[PDB]
Amino acid sequence: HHSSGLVPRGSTSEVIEDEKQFYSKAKTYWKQIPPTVDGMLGGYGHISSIDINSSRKFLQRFLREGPNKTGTSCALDCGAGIGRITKRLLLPLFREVDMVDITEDFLVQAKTYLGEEGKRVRNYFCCGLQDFTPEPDSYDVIWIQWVIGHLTDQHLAEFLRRCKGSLRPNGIIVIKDNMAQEGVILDDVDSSVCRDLDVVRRIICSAGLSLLAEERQENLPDEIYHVYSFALR
């Protein structure tokens, strides 16, 4: 397996006019956001617990049931920010956690935010996912939440292929993100895209990942995009 995740090019978010600017505008945006839960959730800090509760139920099925249970030794939090998910979802379930995020200021704050259980965070990687290669055979769970909209379609596919090579036996990748009502929608404030369900499933499956589970998040505020979770390997 090519360790770079290379695949042939398929479809494109033609809503992304200039790829270099799509990435540089997002990096600039996050560099000035406050390193707080409110900053991570764009004013939706009030749904953080609801989000984490659903994620926990979703993941526990893979850790607790079946003949080929997913292990609990190590997880990778992709686009981790200050560690909201690492603190409340991953550290309680996995012995060690690695974090990767493009924003230096958030990795620095994460040391404070995570408190004492943060001593179980092994590595704080500062990298864009489009440039990041997780170590082979290292993670039981790779968690990718509210960040796939920051990658081009091609870089998303290649990143997931690199992730596949990083999973331990029985490991899974989880994507949890906003889904557009139709097509692909660019947010020019934070420089990210929202894609519809069919588009996302096609990116995953056409990248050669196997979709294991798919679940819509319930009980969210009426006014926001639907949020879905996918398990893949």
């Binding site: 991570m40 959730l41 764009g42 509210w146 906003n178 006014e223 926001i224 995009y225 949020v227």
Partner: peptide, 6 residues
Amino acid sequence: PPKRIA
């Protein structure tokens, strides 16, 4: 983040 339907 989660966000408002534009």
